Design a protein around this ligand. Structure first.
Ligand SMILES: N[C@@H](CCC(=O)N[C@@H](CS)C(=O)NCC(=O)O)C(=O)O
Ligand SMILES: N[C@@H](CCC(=O)N[C@@H](CS)C(=O)NCC(=O)O)C(=O)O
Lengths: 214, 214
């Protein structure tokens, strides 16, 4: 079928989540730029597609979607028999087992890690060290629980890479490789192990290379 | 069939989300109390099933799950042909269409509404009115977008009540009925219509009565 259409820059964490999923699932795509520096996402034209004025948006022959994790669940559903077939499970039980850790990204890991990424890399107000520390300490608590989980299983939800792991890549990679807070991940033995395995997957390497290609 | 097991108090918003789903899906359940004021959610036996020391947790013969929205997706999947069949759609496209608004709850509406609910109703320290204002203003911006959407469709995702609407009930109901922030919903005519329709569903009324009697 025709390549799907993704709106937004690969530097965006939420866009990156979608891109990594497409690549894992062997789904071809067009990428339409949205210039965040020109406030393009906040103007009326883009608002028809993403009503919160955020990236990414998704369009294929059947539907227009927003919210990165919903886009990714759709892709995993539509293209279940394609690419990495086990990415979001293969039946009701394996899917749900992964999904609880996807929700842990969305509700538990994502808020402090995303706020850190924003405040340290993408904000225009002076960095507030007290606020950085607050979210560092919150994220440390989460990663302590991950350290124990990853002492039992190779990946968050079990023995194989899943969307739960994938969903951690965007904020993880900015913290580890673009801030001085990488020790949160790398000083925890099992988290470091996991982080190394997931960030060196072909799909993620391809996303990082796409960022270089502008 | 054997009733599923749910852990936590009905005063909890995340527990309420699961209860409303079970009732919509006509799934019998057994509810195991956890007293949050007494830290029962941190008892080591309970942390074995919910490692973040939060509620709810879910058990049936097949699986133990945490994170309310993951639990609800599993319920909707397992019991697709039961109760309200359309709650999370009936095929790939209708499911995804609902799911983007479920993610909007999780990522956009949920954080400011949940922080308001916590600071105003479940905090041990005084409220910070500057922070209240910050979250009120954030939520107002979200609801301005909903106001536009709900002028186009009856419910968030279309012409039928869905899990997307359901997922807004717990924080919405506390703000409308237990704080002086209800104007956020009631001053917006389409949002108010929607709120009226979804909060008067029998499933939601049953949850509130469970809570009143707990
Ligand atoms: N919850 C959304 C988050 C989207 C989001 O916040 N995107 C950022 C880039 S990572 C954005 O659009 N920034 C520009 C803006 O918010 O105006 C998702 O997962 O898709
Ligand atoms: N993202 C979780 C949220 C769980 C959560 O924060 N639960 C509250 C109840 S509203 C709780 O357990 N609070 C007690 C605590 O965190 O110690 C879910 O949706 O299940």
């Amino acid at each position: 079928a025709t390549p799907v259409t993704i709106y937004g820059p690969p530097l965006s964490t939420a866009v990156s989540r979608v891109l990594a999923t497409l690549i894992e699932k062997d789904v071809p795509f067009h990428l339409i730029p949205i210039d965040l520096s020109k406030g393009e996402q906040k103007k009326p034209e883009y608002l028809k597609i993403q009503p919160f004025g955020q990236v990414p948006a998704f369009k294929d022959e059947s539907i227009t979607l927003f919210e990165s994790r919903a886009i990714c669940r759709y892709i995993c559903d539509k293209y279940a028999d394609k690419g990495n077939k086990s990415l979001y499970g293969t039946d009701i039980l394996s899917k749900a087992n992964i999904d609880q850790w996807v929700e842990t990204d969305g509700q538990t890991f994502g808020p402090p890690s995303g706020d850190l990424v924003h405040d340290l890399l993408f904000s225009s107000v002076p960095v507030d060290e007290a606020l950085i520390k607050k979210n560092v300490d919150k994220l440390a608590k989460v990663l302590d629980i991950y350290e124990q989980k990853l002492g039992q299983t190779r990946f968050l939800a079990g023995d194989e890479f899943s969307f739960a792991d994938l969903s951690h890549l965007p904020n993880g990679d900015y913290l580890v490789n673009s801030t001085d807070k990488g020790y949160l991940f790398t000083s925890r033995k099992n988290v470091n192990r996991w982080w190394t395995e997931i960030s060196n997957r072909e799909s993620w390497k391809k996303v990082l290379e796409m960022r270089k290609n502008a």
